[model samples]
Target: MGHHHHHHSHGQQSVSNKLLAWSGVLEWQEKPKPASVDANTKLTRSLPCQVYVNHGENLKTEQWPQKLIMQLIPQQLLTTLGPLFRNSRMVQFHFTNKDLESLKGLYRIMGNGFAGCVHFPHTAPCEVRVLMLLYSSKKKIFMGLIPYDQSGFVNGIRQVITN
Candidate 1:
């Protein structure tokens, strides 16, 4: 997954908004690299990443400000948002590789889970990512939050421009 640099000035930065944007991107990057394993082990390289999507805007009163996307990095980001994600259905993870081989089965499970928690930003339930941790190495995982939702997915969906 690639990242797009979003410049948030004092005028644009808000506690909640920051949570919505960064967490999604951060988690998306962490997916392939989980913090649960040892640095000496090769798990980090093998566990590339997985993707997930949040509610679409049609459901919310205001256009869903953004779309929240996260990469599955096992104990890293999951631990940060696990408590909240445990109960959310609106959040659907679009997997890069299905933990299970069958894609249809995974989609069914995700579809059922996202029935309720999802909100059309500015609608009944507005969810801003409170925390997200991504592990680039076994030593540490990057943590962050966002105020609204996220801009988009963290992979091929969004291209990165290298300097």
Candidate 2:
């Protein structure tokens, strides 16, 4: 390596006394701690997401496919999810697939109706929102069907999206 040692004039200079004893060490940061600030895992890369499954249509529809009637719904949503699953968990709703009327009420939903309690947080832009909107807009019982069951969910701390 070659050193030019001296520089042609560019601008005014701010001088510091760094040539003193052990000056390089004295000027170094006491604790850089770069990795500590970066260590928490990103949300989408973990595998605990909850996915709700089909229940309402019955063995007729289940027979349309197999023991499970989720068909392209689950296959489509799951793969569309890919790594978003890494940070999520899955829940299968094994009952009827109906909705909206308060006839299903609050505490009643707690028994097995909690699947209605799951979906994506609606804050920043992400992939799942678009998918569920696509599902619900069709007004399909893509969830499950006509049974009286109540559901439980607190929408304050956690964001909730309905299907």
Candidate 3:
């Protein structure tokens, strides 16, 4: 009588002791870089800026004019306005923080956000203008700048105003 024996022939994983444990104990939590620029992707080298978006027509000569103050640093801008950009522009005034005080003006806009802007002669302060967005008024969210000649992510995005 004779008995049969079994042998493991699949061998080990990876060369030179790279693989650890049966479940790969040293495995790192690999995070995938998003290739498409969307509302969630934060541009690591992007702009930190203040953008103002005018609300409606009523006011004249800048009297009690309505503008929303926002920062371009927050991911909010990515979601708030990215939908409207085919590379746009405007001739208006929209500016930022050190933190800028009274973003109560910031928290005044609709939670859904929108776009509007600028006057003749007195405005037009921009050379390469882009659409202004009213980003959610969660004053807790900061991010509001428009891009002109710009770059990043694997590069750049430029602006004429720093405020």
Candidate 4:
């Protein structure tokens, strides 16, 4: 399930924002081994491929709509991510030693009050600085409402938004 503040009129969120909200509930399960990095992987520095494709340019807003930018997963290395923000819990990776050992790909998710790197190293400059800015802004605004009591999340969201 996802909550979108942009549901408000004059608040239609950008496509990236919509996806970030989805990522918030996405649960992650560790792979048996860390995904191996592909040497041939090309770091994507272009703007949102779809945006550029359709509009001939990436959308530029003062604040970005989503928190995730740059995905560099190999076809062979597979992992799962979902069910974000359930039981008063934010999204996080659940990994085992094997999973960590074999972790690959590289991306950043800006929800859940966290922004950190994934398993891959030597990545191309896939900068989502704008996304990061938006994520940080929203996180401070959004995560502050995360209730200490898991049961409080429901009410917290309402109250927090009103603030």
lDDT per residue (tens digit) for residues 21-99 in model 1: 1111111221223345534433221222222333243222233333433333223223333344334323222223334
Please report the candidate that would top lDDT against the real structure.
3
- Which model is ahead, 3 or 4, in terms of TM-score? 3
lDDT of 2: 0.22
* Displacement of the residue 64 alpha carbon in candidate 4, Å: 3.1
* lDDT digits (tens) for residues 37-111 of candidate 2: 533342111111112332332222111111111111112223333343343322222122234232133123222
Ranking according to lDDT, highest score first: 3, 1, 4, 2
Clashes of each: 24, 20, 17, 12
Winner on lDDT between 2 and 4 is 4
lDDT by residue (1-163, candidate 4, tens digit) is 3756533222222323322222111112222224465244333332211111122223232232332333322322111111113322222121111112122221233322333222222322441221111123442221211112423332322333221
> CA lDDT, every prediction?
0.28, 0.22, 0.28, 0.24
Q: Model 1 misses residue 114 by how many Å?
A: 18
Worst 10 residues of 4 by lDDT: 92-101
> Between the candidate structures 1 and 2, which one is better when assessed by TM-score?
1
TM-score of each: 0.21, 0.16, 0.23, 0.16
**Best model per TM-score:** 3
lDDT for 14 in candidate 4 is 31
